[PDB]
Amino acid sequence: MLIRAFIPAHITAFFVPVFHEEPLKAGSLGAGVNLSKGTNVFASIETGTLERHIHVAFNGEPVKREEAEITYYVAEKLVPKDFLGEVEVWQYFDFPNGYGFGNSAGGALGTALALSYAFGGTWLRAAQLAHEAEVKHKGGLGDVIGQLAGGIEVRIKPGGPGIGVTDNLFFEDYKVLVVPLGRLSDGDVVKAIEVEGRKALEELLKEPKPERMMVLARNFAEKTGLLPGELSEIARELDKVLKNPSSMIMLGKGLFALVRDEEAEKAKQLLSDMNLPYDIAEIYTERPKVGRWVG
Amino acid sequence: MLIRAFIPAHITAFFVPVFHEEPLKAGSLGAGVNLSKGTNVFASIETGTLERHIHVAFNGEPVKREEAEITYYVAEKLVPKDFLGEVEVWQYFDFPNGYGFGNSAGGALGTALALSYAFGGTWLRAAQLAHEAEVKHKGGLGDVIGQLAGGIEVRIKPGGPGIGVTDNLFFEDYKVLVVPLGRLSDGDVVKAIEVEGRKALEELLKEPKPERMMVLARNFAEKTGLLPGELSEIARELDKVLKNPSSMIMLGKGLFALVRDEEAEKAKQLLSDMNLPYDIAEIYTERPKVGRWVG
Ligand SMILES: [Ca+2]
Ligand SMILES: [Ca+2]
Ligand SMILES: [Ca+2]
Ligand SMILES: [Ca+2]
Ligand SMILES: [Ca+2]
Ligand code: NA
Ligand code: NA
Ligand code: NA
Ligand code: NA
């Protein structure tokens, strides 16, 4: 009667937004990584009454539909119009909202998988609806499909579940370091993304490697202006300890870098030394989880 | 400095909604008529200040953007983001909202034509944006394109301006009678529209005539349940005086009928006798008007 779903946090390395009035045809090209840390969605469902009510919560606290619009958009569709009872969606995040980790995609997909599992449906149907809700409410373009691909994904063909095409890269002994700082809040960069992005992608499909991605990323963030100087400065210090270049967490004020178990502890020192906040998450190589919550 | 635009009221005879996530590909198949009575949009524009503000009004009274969402959607796009001054859109309707006359399409198109004329643009660009705004805010599917076609239009290929295809029928000595009553406020009819509608269209392209349309309409409204009994009863009385069958104003609680100058006066008696409200409008055979307001 209680369904749990887990969606990994998604961090984009670089990207190219392909906006399209058709949700399923809408998406983005680019590369990202999925963390072992993410969103846990719990769907509680009880039959009864003479009324149909859906309730949503973020980290234990109830949320108005105006702040949960994406999750409600999904729930409204997945919960039968003639259903009588109460549906509760409890979402728990491991990262703050608007920090570039893809929480809304997690809430959209987690919700869609948990409810489809309860009220009937499939993975592709649930996946598409979650994608749809993101694009519809300006939630995101590559988080939902990137989370379905898992691990180190690469969106080579723009589109939603069942339509787009993503690939995965191989990697070894890599963990993810993240220095989350905050949110973000010009026509010049739009054309700087169309170019640097498509360039970074083509260059990655030439050398399919994580190292290559981290280099193609660090360039993308700077060659587009997107990368803040205040971040670039934190980067230049981290780099001195990492075999790979840290890069901006796309659309979030922060940085990330793939690191071995050694460079990690070394970087932990430099960062805690700079009075900076950091997190270490493993690369979630698996796929989203949905099932009866049994522990 | 003051631009005026006139969009005829649009009354649909019957239809078939083709919903499509791509606004321009979205539309409806069907037939309608454009009245000499409609919406007059006046755009007042003054340069100056250090601020950019858009104001909207319906029948002399200012309206919040939440009630003017469609008009603001348009204005926001047509009014330069770097513009400094005040833009005022005064809309005047000849028919109440939600009565099936297409006021929102009139407000959307009128606004789009008046502003494009002021801030630069074209008919197709303005026309498409107005169509877009309708579909986006669930405003309508065939009003904007039907109003561009003018006269007695027939949407044979679903789509928006520049994409869809409408045709026009010939007619003679015909005027329009309308008995507006109110608004409207089941999966069964959805399939009743897909079938009766596409049927009415195919039957019209066999006999391109207004008489035929008025017959194919009176059937469509009933064979789908859409036609209220309380309306059907008013109809059965009108019919006794009209060479042509009155039909329901699609998506509005009312009726309409093409009438000669004679049956008109005769019908005016029967209706004023039934304590009913009625209006006589000529068929607006022309196209929407836009130009500097010079009287
Ligand atoms: Ca759309
Ligand atoms: Ca957690
Ligand atoms: Ca390890
Ligand atoms: Ca008037
Ligand atoms: Ca006459
Ligand atoms: Na997340
Ligand atoms: Na992978
Ligand atoms: Na109108
Ligand atoms: Na005509």
XYZ file of C-alpha atoms and ligand atoms in Angstrom:
599
model
C 0.000 0.000 0.000
C 3.189 2.088 0.208
C 5.309 2.404 -2.948
C 8.900 3.683 -2.994
C 10.868 4.933 -5.980
C 14.458 6.179 -6.256
C 15.687 8.531 -8.956
C 19.377 9.418 -9.031
C 20.410 13.062 -8.966
C 21.454 14.132 -12.445
C 24.333 16.512 -13.122
C 24.833 17.800 -16.666
C 28.415 18.345 -17.877
C 27.484 20.448 -20.898
C 24.450 20.599 -23.159
C 22.562 21.947 -26.159
C 18.877 22.661 -25.608
C 16.578 21.534 -28.364
C 13.281 23.189 -27.613
C 10.303 21.713 -29.380
C 6.561 22.357 -28.976
C 6.078 18.613 -28.968
C 7.115 17.466 -25.433
C 8.248 14.028 -26.627
C 10.302 15.620 -29.408
C 11.742 18.134 -26.975
C 15.022 17.477 -25.217
C 18.691 18.309 -25.203
C 21.979 16.964 -26.482
C 24.811 16.620 -23.998
C 26.496 14.572 -21.295
C 25.821 14.042 -17.598
C 26.356 11.796 -14.594
C 23.930 10.129 -12.206
C 24.716 10.034 -8.489
C 24.043 7.299 -5.955
C 22.486 10.189 -4.012
C 19.104 11.375 -5.203
C 15.403 11.504 -4.694
C 13.329 8.996 -2.819
C 9.610 9.129 -3.594
C 7.065 7.344 -1.419
C 3.479 6.908 -2.621
C 0.908 6.121 0.075
C -2.505 5.124 -1.240
C -5.661 4.352 0.662
C -9.083 3.495 -0.751
C -12.291 4.855 0.788
C -14.457 7.950 1.269
C -16.717 9.795 -1.155
C -13.819 12.129 -2.267
C -10.594 11.928 -4.377
C -7.647 13.830 -2.903
C -3.966 14.031 -3.803
C -1.449 15.400 -1.297
C 2.239 16.180 -1.823
C 5.186 16.746 0.501
C 8.810 17.835 0.126
C 11.172 16.605 2.841
C 8.407 15.844 5.339
C 6.558 19.138 4.833
C 3.284 19.429 2.862
C 3.502 21.571 -0.254
C 0.884 23.599 -2.152
C 0.177 22.396 -5.723
C 1.681 25.687 -6.931
C 5.080 24.566 -5.633
C 4.385 20.936 -6.542
C 2.846 21.668 -9.980
C 5.072 19.147 -11.745
C 4.379 16.335 -9.290
C 0.593 17.182 -9.297
C 0.564 17.322 -13.114
C 1.809 13.754 -13.064
C -0.362 12.563 -10.175
C -3.479 14.094 -11.716
C -2.965 11.964 -14.842
C -1.942 8.756 -13.076
C -4.635 8.908 -10.406
C -8.003 7.760 -11.823
C -10.586 10.536 -12.149
C -13.142 8.182 -10.591
C -10.816 7.043 -7.838
C -12.136 7.526 -4.283
C -9.587 7.920 -1.525
C -6.370 9.701 -0.692
C -3.018 9.649 -2.467
C 0.097 10.934 -0.710
C 3.426 11.590 -2.377
C 6.351 12.006 -0.021
C 9.489 13.209 -1.742
C 12.886 13.345 -0.043
C 15.837 15.055 -1.733
C 19.567 14.677 -1.036
C 20.280 18.051 -2.693
C 18.662 21.531 -2.486
C 16.286 22.679 -5.191
C 17.549 24.846 -8.037
C 21.123 23.719 -7.505
C 21.486 21.887 -10.816
C 20.846 18.360 -9.466
C 17.555 17.628 -11.244
C 15.217 17.346 -8.231
C 12.103 18.170 -10.231
C 12.907 15.355 -12.684
C 13.354 13.073 -9.685
C 10.033 14.143 -8.280
C 8.357 13.806 -11.652
C 9.771 10.384 -12.498
C 9.661 8.985 -8.978
C 5.987 10.000 -8.768
C 5.205 8.650 -12.209
C 6.828 5.268 -11.492
C 5.342 4.859 -8.044
C 1.795 5.759 -9.165
C 1.900 3.813 -12.440
C 2.943 0.839 -10.335
C -0.066 1.434 -8.106
C -2.776 2.399 -10.598
C -1.478 0.455 -13.605
C 0.804 1.508 -16.452
C 4.320 0.883 -17.747
C 7.852 2.261 -17.590
C 7.754 4.014 -20.956
C 4.304 5.499 -20.266
C 5.384 6.701 -16.817
C 8.742 7.848 -18.153
C 7.191 9.875 -20.980
C 4.633 11.546 -18.710
C 7.415 12.613 -16.322
C 9.429 13.961 -19.225
C 6.317 15.738 -20.512
C 5.656 17.415 -17.142
C 9.239 18.686 -16.991
C 9.231 20.324 -20.415
C 5.652 21.606 -19.914
C 6.549 23.445 -16.697
C 10.075 24.432 -17.791
C 11.421 21.780 -15.383
C 14.225 20.396 -17.511
C 15.125 18.908 -20.862
C 17.674 16.176 -20.181
C 17.265 15.130 -16.561
C 14.498 12.542 -16.930
C 16.022 10.765 -19.924
C 19.483 11.087 -18.441
C 18.264 9.385 -15.247
C 16.747 6.513 -17.242
C 20.105 5.980 -18.986
C 21.931 5.942 -15.663
C 25.659 6.193 -15.061
C 27.569 8.549 -17.343
C 24.996 9.238 -20.033
C 25.362 11.081 -23.327
C 22.315 12.422 -25.166
C 23.170 12.022 -28.841
C 19.675 12.412 -30.278
C 17.269 15.024 -28.763
C 13.886 13.754 -27.603
C 11.920 12.236 -24.759
C 11.628 8.617 -23.572
C 10.882 6.267 -26.432
C 11.951 8.916 -28.913
C 15.366 10.272 -27.946
C 18.674 8.372 -27.946
C 21.273 8.390 -25.188
C 24.443 6.345 -24.893
C 26.618 5.449 -21.935
C 30.376 5.641 -21.469
C 32.562 3.170 -19.654
C 34.588 4.279 -16.673
C 36.642 2.888 -13.845
C 37.329 3.661 -10.191
C 35.523 6.981 -10.481
C 33.505 8.724 -7.827
C 31.869 12.169 -7.957
C 32.834 15.208 -5.905
C 30.448 18.150 -5.728
C 30.810 21.667 -4.366
C 27.213 22.994 -4.326
C 26.984 26.725 -3.747
C 23.625 28.004 -4.900
C 21.205 28.816 -7.716
C 21.608 30.955 -10.856
C 18.720 33.413 -11.289
C 21.665 36.883 -22.543
C 21.031 36.141 -26.209
C 24.823 36.020 -26.499
C 25.150 32.683 -24.669
C 22.232 31.061 -26.507
C 24.369 30.994 -29.645
C 27.381 30.134 -27.462
C 25.576 27.003 -26.330
C 24.374 25.954 -29.771
C 27.992 26.023 -30.946
C 30.222 25.012 -28.030
C 27.728 22.324 -27.063
C 27.292 20.578 -30.418
C 31.050 20.861 -30.666
C 31.655 19.188 -27.307
C 29.303 16.359 -28.259
C 30.900 15.647 -31.634
C 34.312 15.712 -29.929
C 33.095 13.220 -27.309
C 31.723 10.776 -29.875
C 35.316 10.803 -31.195
C 36.825 10.043 -27.917
C 34.218 8.230 -25.770
C 35.800 8.763 -22.359
C 35.012 10.397 -19.006
C 38.383 12.171 -18.927
C 37.608 13.641 -22.328
C 34.160 14.726 -21.117
C 35.594 16.533 -18.091
C 37.913 18.454 -20.410
C 35.243 19.176 -23.029
C 33.061 20.363 -20.138
C 35.527 22.705 -18.400
C 35.920 24.380 -21.799
C 32.191 24.563 -22.563
C 31.460 26.353 -19.277
C 34.122 29.003 -19.959
C 33.843 29.367 -23.734
C 30.198 30.322 -23.142
C 30.565 32.718 -20.224
C 28.230 30.498 -18.196
C 31.019 29.723 -15.755
C 31.169 32.407 -13.033
C 34.579 33.776 -12.137
C 33.899 33.058 -8.489
C 33.504 29.414 -9.538
C 36.418 29.403 -11.955
C 38.601 30.454 -9.023
C 37.464 27.515 -6.900
C 38.088 25.332 -9.937
C 41.657 26.480 -10.546
C 42.452 25.434 -6.981
C 40.734 22.035 -7.195
C 42.396 21.225 -10.516
C 45.816 21.436 -8.840
C 44.848 18.279 -6.924
C 42.784 16.451 -9.565
C 43.991 14.431 -12.560
C 40.806 15.683 -14.181
C 39.437 19.220 -14.484
C 36.487 20.184 -12.289
C 33.628 21.801 -14.207
C 30.514 23.802 -13.503
C 27.390 21.877 -12.550
C 25.318 23.044 -15.520
C 22.520 25.378 -14.452
C 23.552 25.381 -10.832
C 26.104 27.470 -8.964
C 28.577 24.729 -8.166
C 31.284 22.407 -9.412
C 31.841 18.696 -9.726
C 34.591 16.349 -10.782
C 35.162 12.641 -11.214
C 37.745 11.619 -8.636
C 39.626 8.493 -7.564
C 39.490 7.465 -3.903
C 42.839 9.233 -3.405
C 42.446 12.630 -5.078
C 39.198 12.677 -3.121
C 40.602 12.874 0.394
C 43.184 15.304 -0.980
C 40.466 17.501 -2.449
C 38.424 17.213 0.751
C 41.273 18.930 2.560
C 41.625 21.801 0.093
C 37.873 22.416 0.115
C 37.208 22.165 3.847
C 40.216 24.464 4.046
C 38.503 27.025 1.817
C 35.459 26.940 4.102
C 33.528 25.365 1.224
C 30.628 22.857 1.241
C 31.229 19.520 -0.504
C 29.607 16.150 -1.167
C 30.852 12.800 -2.398
C 28.498 10.562 -4.311
C 29.198 7.367 -6.242
C 28.153 7.188 -9.892
C 24.734 5.500 -9.905
C 25.280 3.004 -12.726
C 21.930 1.322 -12.213
C 18.436 2.319 -13.312
C 15.619 4.058 -11.380
C 13.975 1.862 -8.739
C 10.254 1.301 -8.140
C 8.595 -1.300 -5.911
C 6.523 -2.024 -2.818
C 8.377 -0.410 0.095
C 9.590 -3.394 2.065
C 12.771 -1.931 3.546
C -0.202 56.564 -32.323
C -3.571 54.810 -31.945
C -4.117 51.580 -33.899
C -7.524 49.961 -34.449
C -8.243 46.399 -35.518
C -11.542 44.612 -36.188
C -12.016 40.865 -35.935
C -15.400 39.412 -36.854
C -17.225 37.233 -34.349
C -16.884 33.600 -35.362
C -19.674 31.054 -34.977
C -18.887 27.387 -35.606
C -21.600 25.231 -37.217
C -20.003 21.896 -36.357
C -16.431 20.749 -35.843
C -13.827 18.077 -35.165
C -11.051 19.045 -32.768
C -7.585 18.010 -33.800
C -5.464 18.533 -30.734
C -1.751 18.650 -31.348
C 1.155 19.553 -29.042
C 2.496 21.707 -31.836
C 0.348 24.912 -31.765
C 0.736 25.535 -35.504
C -0.231 21.931 -36.253
C -3.156 22.165 -33.865
C -6.598 23.122 -35.098
C -9.988 21.774 -36.017
C -11.949 20.662 -39.046
C -15.395 22.143 -39.537
C -17.521 25.006 -40.810
C -18.409 28.430 -39.433
C -19.620 31.928 -40.244
C -18.142 35.349 -39.554
C -20.413 38.192 -38.455
C -20.252 41.875 -39.325
C -20.462 42.254 -35.535
C -17.309 41.492 -33.601
C -14.356 42.748 -31.684
C -12.752 46.126 -32.033
C -9.227 46.352 -30.628
C -7.525 49.696 -30.069
C -3.788 49.854 -29.354
C -2.536 53.083 -27.770
C 1.238 53.411 -27.627
C 3.337 56.138 -26.100
C 7.127 56.315 -25.881
C 8.901 57.608 -22.768
C 9.803 56.853 -19.146
C 12.356 54.466 -17.673
C 9.750 51.590 -17.510
C 7.922 49.207 -19.932
C 4.259 48.630 -19.082
C 1.412 46.888 -20.885
C -2.195 47.535 -19.855
C -5.355 45.777 -21.043
C -9.057 46.608 -20.919
C -12.303 44.819 -21.770
C -15.223 47.082 -22.675
C -13.723 50.185 -21.066
C -12.717 48.452 -17.825
C -9.097 47.521 -16.975
C -8.465 43.803 -16.622
C -5.875 41.828 -14.631
C -3.415 39.787 -16.749
C -5.008 36.661 -15.251
C -8.239 37.469 -17.097
C -6.343 38.879 -20.081
C -3.700 36.102 -20.229
C -4.238 35.499 -23.941
C -4.007 39.167 -24.896
C -0.934 39.639 -22.576
C 0.712 36.504 -24.009
C 0.496 38.170 -27.394
C 1.417 41.673 -26.229
C 4.408 40.377 -24.275
C 5.846 38.893 -27.486
C 4.988 41.798 -29.786
C 6.123 44.527 -27.405
C 9.940 44.843 -27.444
C 11.633 43.717 -24.226
C 13.753 46.876 -24.372
C 10.826 49.129 -25.172
C 10.307 52.049 -22.760
C 6.804 53.420 -22.424
C 3.215 52.327 -22.049
C 1.095 50.101 -24.271
C -2.684 50.044 -23.873
C -5.007 47.526 -25.471
C -8.666 48.469 -25.445
C -10.936 45.659 -26.543
C -14.649 46.109 -27.214
C -16.895 43.094 -27.811
C -20.335 42.936 -29.449
C -21.069 39.599 -27.725
C -20.619 38.280 -24.144
C -17.671 36.074 -23.294
C -18.066 32.301 -23.264
C -21.115 32.454 -25.503
C -19.539 30.699 -28.483
C -18.697 33.852 -30.487
C -14.894 33.636 -30.373
C -14.105 36.787 -28.355
C -10.744 35.505 -27.158
C -9.680 34.861 -30.769
C -10.803 38.396 -31.572
C -8.801 39.766 -28.698
C -5.802 37.656 -29.617
C -5.813 38.481 -33.325
C -6.899 42.093 -32.964
C -4.059 42.621 -30.469
C -1.554 40.782 -32.618
C -2.434 42.790 -35.745
C -2.542 46.148 -34.022
C 0.794 45.638 -32.218
C 2.606 44.036 -35.163
C 1.526 47.081 -37.145
C 3.018 49.293 -34.452
C 6.208 47.440 -33.518
C 6.869 45.757 -36.870
C 5.867 42.335 -38.176
C 3.539 40.763 -40.732
C 0.069 39.268 -41.095
C 1.181 35.639 -41.018
C 3.503 36.242 -38.047
C 0.773 38.093 -36.142
C -1.840 35.568 -37.223
C 0.228 32.583 -36.077
C 1.046 34.133 -32.697
C -2.665 34.785 -32.073
C -3.483 31.224 -33.050
C -0.669 29.998 -30.797
C -1.973 31.959 -27.788
C -5.457 30.505 -28.261
C -4.369 26.869 -28.339
C -1.804 27.462 -25.552
C -4.433 28.827 -23.151
C -7.256 26.541 -24.334
C -8.811 29.579 -26.066
C -9.974 27.926 -29.263
C -8.931 25.819 -32.217
C -10.758 27.215 -35.239
C -11.717 30.791 -34.424
C -8.519 32.582 -35.452
C -8.100 30.763 -38.763
C -11.822 30.923 -39.401
C -11.730 34.713 -38.935
C -8.839 35.042 -41.397
C -10.860 33.099 -43.995
C -13.875 35.336 -43.461
C -17.427 34.761 -44.632
C -18.675 31.179 -44.500
C -15.449 29.282 -43.928
C -14.793 25.547 -43.951
C -11.687 24.097 -42.303
C -10.734 21.151 -44.496
C -7.179 20.651 -43.252
C -6.398 21.047 -39.492
C -3.657 23.505 -38.570
C -2.812 27.097 -37.775
C -2.179 30.085 -40.070
C 0.290 29.246 -42.801
C -0.215 25.553 -42.151
C -3.929 24.750 -42.149
C -6.324 24.960 -45.110
C -9.776 26.523 -45.098
C -12.144 27.083 -47.995
C -15.091 29.406 -48.451
C -18.596 28.746 -49.738
C -20.666 31.003 -51.930
C -23.989 32.294 -50.701
C -26.651 34.811 -51.556
C -29.023 37.156 -49.742
C -28.154 35.571 -46.409
C -27.990 37.258 -43.050
C -27.368 35.691 -39.627
C -29.847 35.453 -36.767
C -28.585 34.592 -33.297
C -30.360 33.690 -30.073
C -27.590 33.893 -27.431
C -28.566 32.393 -24.098
C -25.473 31.606 -22.083
C -22.355 29.503 -21.531
C -21.871 25.722 -21.269
C -19.790 24.757 -18.219
C -18.316 13.109 -21.304
C -15.993 10.723 -23.121
C -19.121 9.617 -24.982
C -19.373 12.815 -27.058
C -15.646 12.940 -27.844
C -16.119 9.927 -30.107
C -19.463 11.401 -31.212
C -17.616 14.454 -32.482
C -14.821 12.555 -34.208
C -17.463 10.680 -36.202
C -20.410 13.018 -36.792
C -18.003 15.868 -37.473
C -15.738 14.228 -40.056
C -18.955 12.945 -41.561
C -20.523 16.399 -41.795
C -17.372 17.750 -43.436
C -17.115 15.030 -46.078
C -20.827 15.520 -46.811
C -20.293 19.276 -47.214
C -17.386 18.879 -49.629
C -19.932 16.915 -51.706
C -22.474 19.586 -51.633
C -20.699 22.939 -51.081
C -23.681 24.997 -49.947
C -24.858 27.000 -46.925
C -28.251 25.268 -46.930
C -26.468 21.931 -46.801
C -24.275 23.169 -43.939
C -27.277 24.266 -41.876
C -28.756 20.788 -42.285
C -25.484 18.954 -41.616
C -25.143 21.172 -38.536
C -28.613 20.689 -37.015
C -27.893 16.954 -37.228
C -24.376 17.164 -35.775
C -25.612 19.014 -32.678
C -28.278 16.371 -31.984
C -26.489 13.211 -33.111
C -23.824 14.071 -30.521
C -26.001 15.025 -27.565
C -24.309 18.435 -27.507
C -27.593 20.125 -28.343
C -29.568 20.820 -25.142
C -33.250 19.954 -25.155
C -34.066 23.442 -23.948
C -32.366 24.672 -27.132
C -33.840 22.014 -29.391
C -37.263 23.260 -28.298
C -36.472 26.839 -29.298
C -35.154 25.429 -32.563
C -38.266 23.434 -33.437
C -40.243 26.667 -33.167
C -37.820 28.762 -35.239
C -37.618 26.123 -37.966
C -41.361 26.509 -38.597
C -40.572 29.998 -39.930
C -37.186 29.378 -41.581
C -36.432 27.768 -44.949
C -33.280 26.576 -43.223
C -32.837 24.755 -39.912
C -31.472 26.726 -36.962
C -28.564 25.017 -35.205
C -26.667 25.268 -31.960
C -23.898 27.849 -31.762
C -21.103 25.345 -31.138
C -19.720 25.630 -27.613
C -22.185 28.281 -26.580
C -25.724 28.017 -25.248
C -27.535 29.532 -28.196
C -28.764 29.119 -31.744
C -28.192 30.741 -35.095
C -29.535 30.483 -38.604
C -28.924 32.004 -42.006
C -32.028 33.990 -42.896
C -33.349 36.079 -45.785
C -34.565 39.610 -45.057
C -38.120 38.223 -44.887
C -37.894 35.136 -42.671
C -35.942 37.486 -40.426
C -38.732 39.855 -39.441
C -40.974 36.795 -39.171
C -38.526 35.098 -36.827
C -38.074 38.329 -34.866
C -41.752 38.146 -33.985
C -41.697 34.522 -32.838
C -38.608 35.135 -30.707
C -39.590 38.433 -29.097
C -42.851 36.602 -28.474
C -41.034 33.849 -26.585
C -39.367 36.483 -24.399
C -36.055 35.503 -26.001
C -32.930 37.593 -26.750
C -31.868 37.852 -30.403
C -29.341 39.547 -32.676
C -29.056 40.065 -36.409
C -25.633 40.325 -37.967
C -24.610 40.332 -41.624
C -22.077 37.756 -42.805
C -18.692 39.507 -42.682
C -17.323 38.458 -46.075
C -14.227 40.611 -45.763
C -10.970 40.053 -43.895
C -9.798 41.359 -40.487
C -8.977 45.078 -40.459
C -5.875 46.784 -39.050
C -4.762 50.394 -39.509
C -4.129 53.783 -37.929
C -7.399 54.789 -36.249
C -8.566 57.689 -38.367
C -12.326 57.298 -37.968
Ca 3.153 22.289 -26.729
Ca 17.663 10.729 1.140
Ca 35.628 3.516 -3.564
Ca -18.653 47.294 -30.905
Ca -30.389 42.979 -46.415
Na 18.022 14.816 -8.003
Na 27.958 4.486 -18.158
Na -16.008 37.647 -31.511
Na -17.652 32.630 -48.265
